[PDB]
A paper describes a structure:
The xylan-specific α-glucuronidases from glycoside hydrolase family 115 (GH115) specifically catalyse the removal of α-d-glucuronic acid (GlcA) or methylated GlcA (MeGlcA). In this study, we report crystal structures of a bacterial GH115 ortholog (wtsAgu115A) identified in a metagenome from an anaerobic digester fed with wastewater treatment sludge. Furthermore, wtsAgu115A eluted from a gel-filtration column at a volume consistent with a dimer in solution, which suggests that wtsAgu115A is a dimer in its active form similar to other GH115 xylan-specific α-glucuronidases.
A crystal structure at 2.65 Å resolution of wtsAgu115A originating from a metagenome from an anaerobic digester fed with wastewater treatment sludge was determined in complex with xylohexaose, and Asp303 was identified as the likely general acid. The sum of φ and ψ for the glycosidic linkages between the xylose moiety pairs at +2NR and +1NR, at +1NR and +1, at +1 and +1R and at +1R and +2R are 47°, 27°, 57° and 13°, respectively, which indicates that the xylan backbone is forced out of conformation upon forming the Michaelis–Menten complex. The xylohexaose-bound crystal structure forms a Michaelis–Menten-like complex, which reveals how the dimer interface of the enzyme orients xylan in the active site guided by residues from each protomer of the homodimer. If this were the case, a distant residue could activate the active-site water nucleophile, which was also suggested to be the case for cellulases in glycoside hydrolase family 6. The wtsAgu115A–xylohexaose structure revealed a proton wire leading from Ca2+ site 1 to Tyr403 through the active-site cavity via water molecules w427, w446 and w484 and likely beyond Ca2+ site 1. Thus, the proton required for catalysis could be delivered through this proton wire. Interestingly, upon formation of the Michaelis–Menten-like complex, Tyr403 moved nearly 170° and the nearby histidine residues His246 and His247 also underwent conformational changes, indicating the importance of Tyr403 in particular in catalysis.
Author numbering:
A (entry chain A), B (entry chain A): -1 to 306, 318 to 838
Write the structure that this text describes.
Amino acid sequence: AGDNKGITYEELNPERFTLLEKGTPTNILIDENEDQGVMIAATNLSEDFGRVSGTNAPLIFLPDNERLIIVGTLESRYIKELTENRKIKGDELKGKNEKYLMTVVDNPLPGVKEALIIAGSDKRGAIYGIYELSEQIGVSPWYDWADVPVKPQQNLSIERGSYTADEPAVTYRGIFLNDEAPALTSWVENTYGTKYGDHRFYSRVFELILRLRGNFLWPAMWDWSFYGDDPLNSKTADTMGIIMGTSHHEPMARNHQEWARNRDKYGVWDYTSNQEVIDQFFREGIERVKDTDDLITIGMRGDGDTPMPSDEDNMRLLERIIKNQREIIGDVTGESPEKTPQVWAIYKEVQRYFDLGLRPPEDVIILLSDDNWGNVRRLPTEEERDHPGGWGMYYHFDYVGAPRSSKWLNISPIQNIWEQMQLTYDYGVDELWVANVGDLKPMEYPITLFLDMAWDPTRFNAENLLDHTRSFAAQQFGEDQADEAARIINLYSKYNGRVTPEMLDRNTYNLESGEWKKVSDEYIKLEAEALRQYLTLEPEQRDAYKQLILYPVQAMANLYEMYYSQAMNHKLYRENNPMANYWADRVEETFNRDAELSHDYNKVMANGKWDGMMTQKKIGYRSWNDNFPADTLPQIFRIENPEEATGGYVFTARDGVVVIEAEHYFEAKDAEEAKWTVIPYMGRTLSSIALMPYTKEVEGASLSYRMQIPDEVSEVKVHVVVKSTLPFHDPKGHEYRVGFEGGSKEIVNFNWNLNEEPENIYSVFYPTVASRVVKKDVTLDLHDTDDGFYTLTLEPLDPGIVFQKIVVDFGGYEESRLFMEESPNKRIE
Amino acid sequence: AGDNKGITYEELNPERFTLLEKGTPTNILIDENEDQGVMIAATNLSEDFGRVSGTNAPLIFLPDNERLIIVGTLESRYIKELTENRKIKGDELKGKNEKYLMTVVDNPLPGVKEALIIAGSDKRGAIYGIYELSEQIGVSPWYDWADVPVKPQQNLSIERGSYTADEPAVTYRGIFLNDEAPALTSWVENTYGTKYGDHRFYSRVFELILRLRGNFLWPAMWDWSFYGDDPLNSKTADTMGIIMGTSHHEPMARNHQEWARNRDKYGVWDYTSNQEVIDQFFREGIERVKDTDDLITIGMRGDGDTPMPSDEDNMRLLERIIKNQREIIGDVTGESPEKTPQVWAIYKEVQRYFDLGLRPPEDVIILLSDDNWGNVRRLPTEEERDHPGGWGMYYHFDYVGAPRSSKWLNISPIQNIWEQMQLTYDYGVDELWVANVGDLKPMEYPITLFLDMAWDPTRFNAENLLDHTRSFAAQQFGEDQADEAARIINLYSKYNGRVTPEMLDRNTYNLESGEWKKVSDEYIKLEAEALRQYLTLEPEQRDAYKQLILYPVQAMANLYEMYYSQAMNHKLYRENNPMANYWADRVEETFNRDAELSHDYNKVMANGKWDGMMTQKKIGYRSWNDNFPADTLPQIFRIENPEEATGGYVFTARDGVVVIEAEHYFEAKDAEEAKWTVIPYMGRTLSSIALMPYTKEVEGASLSYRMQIPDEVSEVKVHVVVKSTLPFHDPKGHEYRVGFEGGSKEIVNFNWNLNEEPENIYSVFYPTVASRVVKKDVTLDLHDTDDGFYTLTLEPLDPGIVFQKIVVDFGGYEESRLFMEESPNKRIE
Ligand SMILES: O[C@@H]1[C@@H](O)[C@H](O[C@@H]2CO[C@@H](O[C@@H]3CO[C@@H](O[C@@H]4CO[C@@H](O[C@@H]5CO[C@@H](O)[C@H](O)[C@H]5O)[C@H](O)[C@H]4O)[C@H](O)[C@H]3O)[C@H](O)[C@H]2O)OC[C@H]1O
Ligand SMILES: O[C@@H]1[C@@H](O)[C@H](O[C@@H]2CO[C@@H](O[C@@H]3CO[C@@H](O[C@@H]4CO[C@@H](O[C@@H]5CO[C@@H](O)[C@H](O)[C@H]5O)[C@H](O)[C@H]4O)[C@H](O)[C@H]3O)[C@H](O)[C@H]2O)OC[C@H]1O
Ligand SMILES: [Ca+2]
Ligand SMILES: [Ca+2]
Ligand SMILES: [Ca+2]
Ligand SMILES: [Ca+2]
Ligand SMILES: [Ca+2]
Ligand SMILES: [Ca+2]
Ligand SMILES: [Cl-]
Ligand SMILES: [Cl-]
Ligand SMILES: [Cl-]
Ligand SMILES: [Cl-]
Ligand SMILES: [Cl-]
Ligand SMILES: [Cl-]
Ligand SMILES: [Cl-]
Ligand SMILES: [Cl-]
Ligand SMILES: [Cl-]
Ligand SMILES: [Cl-]
Ligand SMILES: [Cl-]
Ligand SMILES: [Cl-]
Ligand SMILES: [Cl-]
Ligand SMILES: [Cl-]
Ligand SMILES: [Cl-]
Ligand SMILES: [Cl-]
Ligand SMILES: [Cl-]
Ligand SMILES: [Cl-]
Ligand SMILES: [Cl-]
Ligand SMILES: [Cl-]
Ligand SMILES: [Cl-]
Ligand SMILES: [Cl-]
Ligand SMILES: [Cl-]
Ligand SMILES: [Cl-]
Ligand SMILES: [Cl-]
Ligand SMILES: [Cl-]
């Protein structure tokens, strides 16, 4: 159900029209001389009933059956017979652009008791109506290009009534295959054996664009020539009903490589110098595509993506170029020039030629363009909205250039596409919308949004935008999966809008403020939610879910954690803290995970159907272009010999406290026989530390913490957190001596009251014990010093004390389960 | 490989002993009059070769085969023949406790060219050696009780040499089934049809304890009587080689329920009052277990978990009770009393009886006990370490009582078990170690650690502790999975140590400081890492992974997010912010997910093998006990009519700034025709807001933000972040007027310089555009006010400005990608 939702049911009903009964499809009646592109779509619908039911819908040319699905254009014999007998409201289609009419009617023809009619105003309107039914029975436009499975059915009925999508609001609506190496090129080679895009590949692109209800394509042009590499390319597009175009610097239906490949035979591409050969270039161009409905790019820039002393009389060079471009069209097409659709794209030295009134002939479409990052540059004023030929918009989902290429994943928030396209429509630009899609994949969702907006931008607003995302998800994964799948698509798109993967690195986010950890943790949360959903899917759904959701999310969550880890590696390495080695390991592991994930996408997902599609490098950019060998491991640093890199931590106060994890001492003096032993992971946070073993005297032992406090401070509250050890050796309890060396020192008895005596047993004892820790505080007078450095000192007086955390409190203390983030520190010897 | 690692290979070798060749196991030779418990283990080993190879190892009674695995005790005929011919070092086993000897020997007996010998010093030492081989060939002790699959093999050889575990350091090592309703009781009923634990159930518990190398059990005693409910219970334990005991208040081999069930027939349980019937109770107790090696609890507390005016002569009551308890043992056992192992547990009014020297007879074991939360209360002094009978330790992994029961999941950090048990051993307590395991599951890992420490505590230290976890993981999931599986077990155990699930709620963690978000996000990260690992497992491994890792992690990560969400719900509801409704929904969803997860564990995992094991309630505690109906939805609050709950936000400064998300205005005046429209999710953070549509004049419109600043502030820097809209309508750019109403106001032109002119194109233009936002700052003079409240005002002057975020900066501003955490605020009308 693309256009009309909730009219096809999975049970039959007397007051509904049966499309499929106990496995057998209803036959499709078609005029055998129907437009060949419409027959192709009808054949695809016949096979779509095959995908649903197990048997193809018989495609017939005579009303043999008592009930029928009758398809065709207004001019085909059966539709023509229906409008003439007023069985169908033909007035609602005659003259209309790309419109279908879908309605059940009783006794359409003699011998037919009841039929579903799909009548198109023209070729494409018939195709669209057919594919509307295709969706109704459960074949997503993405059934091939993103492996979206078809729910098998045994019976289908459709509600009566008259159904339409009306006419599209934008005349030309399509995509540009661009930035296509190495991905799309690798995939076309692996799949078709061709170092070019041939008509097998392009017809497969055409069916998609048509199922999506678009009509337009700029073919790939980096190393290919859509018109020259295969003579069926133009012929197939013309038959199937795609309008072909060329990009802004490819005038006159010549693909750029047709000139490049023969720079030796051809001249220089300077109109005044090389006029003769270039005019011949242009002519055979229009010669090749006359009798098709292709858009003719007119004008002239440079060759490559460069422009072309100028100013007054240079503007008159362009004027001239358009003039004789049009007589060339006239001499070839036979008709006059305004009978051939033409488009003049504007860029650099043209917005400037705009003001003195450089406009093309009235009939020509003026193709505006975005900034390569989704923001429109110029729009028509109220005065020039008049323009008869109308206006286009070229929009980027993918871009190679400044400030850095973006070639890997979708980077376009849903809100950003809509917010800028709604503006585009509201200012009158509605003749051509074409979006740069990179390799097509993985832009599946923005493409669907882009084209659905081009059909009817009026049905989108800020409140209902994500309703579109939810509908898309329900189509791909089913009603039960839809809310959560759309939620993920929206979120990962938004995260990707924050910074492109190619421009993400260790310095993107703020590390001290905790921002890096937030966005890294939060993307992994999204990955966890996508993993949970993935386990609930039916097997036949996993490949589509991975292509539309799981791989983008996993690959980005992994990329984020990699750079976050690099940022932590450098911080700890600067600080001389051997924990740097852990984060170095994480960088390595996440870097390799990135290759694991793309290897899966290419080689394992869908049995390697998409091998090549996910081979763009992404890690190792140094300039704007991806001209470096391959994904490169971000630089990491390691502390040699990390076991003898202990002690010597000195802290600096921040935000009212000095919070210290107990193992980050400045020095530790061992006892007689018993030695300071750190216990990894023990406690609520970093680790614990204790003299071992517990059978030895602790006499003389001490831990020492070096810290800097602002001179304005006169007394402090010292919190020491230890493990909730009980008084096992001696009922009077465990004591330790805390104090600033050079100043006053109190002793703490932290478990004298942890027992089963009535006043303690439930008031203190069981509560503290079930928490596993005890926290004591002394209040200590801070003496004077000239450098501001102090040495806090912890001296145990009984065995088995497990020190865990210290916080000196001079204002900024916050009650909390983990006893606050550790204060800044670094290491010395 | 439990005891000896890296001696069994998957290929054969001339200098190794073949255990399995091309599918055929080597035969096991056993004396047919061998101890019946040893034969049982040998039969289990025969079937373990079946689990590995597909065919069971033939178990034979004569040396028919040229090569053999020869098992038995020192007294069985074949082992006896080997030690006498000095083929085996019998001196290394005679007298030793529970020791095996495993060694290849050539020509052991005539007609046998080569055999692997497994000789035990006694019954249990033989069993242990057999199960050592069981592990060598790949059968985990957890192959049944946690579904750990057996890697199929076609050939196995074992290295030559002499192999042993020596003797255990703790004489009795076992578990207490306790807190066993509703889980273990439900599972036993579902599995065996019995509202009691019968000998089918207990033998299955025995095989586990033996494969784990323990020898001790306190059976379940809440509603069952191990000795009374089934006469094969004692007989099976005696045959298989388990030492049975009873808990601290179950004297004389009587299970508590044997008294409870007949409170009517029996008397009151007051020794002085009801002496006659209680002595008869005690007697038939010892009568029932004489001729077995069971531990006899002596002493007397109350019935229930309560004690029993006292002081001087009351201590003489206990003295007397022990005295005649021992003559009862003497009159029944025939021998004297010190020939029967006895244990006196100490609790409440006994540590006090301790000081005046209340000690039992010298031969009796004194069973100390922890605090029910893993911390030891008393340990022997150097003077009383002398005690001939020795000392025990009762340790909790599970507990019903103060301050709140803990009955759902493992809560014991690995470090905490070790740190307190290493102390226990070092102080001389090495006769009995028994751990309260709840329902056994899901304590699989702490049980293995506990018992492995009881075998040889000397091999554990702070540095190598987690080596044990890694070895355990490699056994359950394979070398390739081990590091990451152990990492997860360690972490989730640590997190659970921070607070028990039953005591977790909205107020556990600090929300303002971001601590709640940290621990919630971090547990979900652990879940994501466990999910990733789960997808790499072979199918046959998934059930074990879910039981030992995935379900604890998912269930806790979900529980944490639930309470975190509740905490957010209440904060936003207090603040009158309709976002509260989102968090209410999350509480509901996570609450139901908790039931999804346990439904899976019970009913779907392993085809419902474990149905009942995971039915403990956990959500809805109000006191210490789980006496409430069922898991209950934590209380949430919702803002009625949340669409008309906009505007009226007023902010309070914190930490040097006022950070405002653009949609949290105090008031918004609409324009003529164009209306303030908020665009969900748009931008880097909360959302965007803009006058729509863009075709209307914006004259007069404004947003207003109300905020409180400390009176000490005289001027501010105001940062406004908008979308990077370009100057599409008018090349001079977009302008807006920012200022404090009642004070000065500057205007900002944020895109006058976003174009392709040479000085802008790569310096500013492409960088800002690819970032999707622009940030401008004015510096504004702050005027005087008496309440400290100000009204910042944003007035657009051109169409299409997308406001996203504001931060007024008076010191605390931090450069960051998201422009800082939003400042505190609330809502009014
Ligand atoms: O950082 C700042 C820089 O941004 C600034 O650098 C400018 C960036 O913008 C660049 O213009 C882009 C150049 O690249 C064009 O794409 C072409 C398309 O043709 C491709 O050729 C094919 C490649 O694949 C092969 O296999 C095949 O054989 C080829 O036919 C070519 O690879 C691409 O580069 C873009 O469309 C332009 O937008 C500009 O050149 C830079 O100068 O400098 C300042 C610095 O501060
Ligand atoms: O919050 C503070 C409180 O902590 C304090 O409350 C005390 C908590 O400690 C309690 O002692 C525990 C009581 O419960 C015992 O377990 C029994 C075992 O027997 C069970 O009976 C079976 C239940 O299942 C049935 O199906 C079966 O038929 C029964 O046989 C019974 O359910 C359990 O309760 C524990 O072992 C004790 O440790 C103490 O009673 C409380 O007073 O009060 C102060 C407050 O501030
Ligand atoms: Ca790409
Ligand atoms: Ca029009
Ligand atoms: Ca790679
Ligand atoms: Ca339990
Ligand atoms: Ca001993
Ligand atoms: Ca439940
Ligand atoms: Cl087809
Ligand atoms: Cl419509
Ligand atoms: Cl070719
Ligand atoms: Cl034509
Ligand atoms: Cl034409
Ligand atoms: Cl709108
Ligand atoms: Cl809605
Ligand atoms: Cl952004
Ligand atoms: Cl900070
Ligand atoms: Cl670590
Ligand atoms: Cl040291
Ligand atoms: Cl004190
Ligand atoms: Cl002391
Ligand atoms: Cl068995
Ligand atoms: Cl050992
Ligand atoms: Cl019974
Ligand atoms: Cl015996
Ligand atoms: Cl005996
Ligand atoms: Cl030790
Ligand atoms: Cl190690
Ligand atoms: Cl804790
Ligand atoms: Cl804070
Ligand atoms: Cl939300
Ligand atoms: Cl409003
Ligand atoms: Cl300016
Ligand atoms: Cl203006």
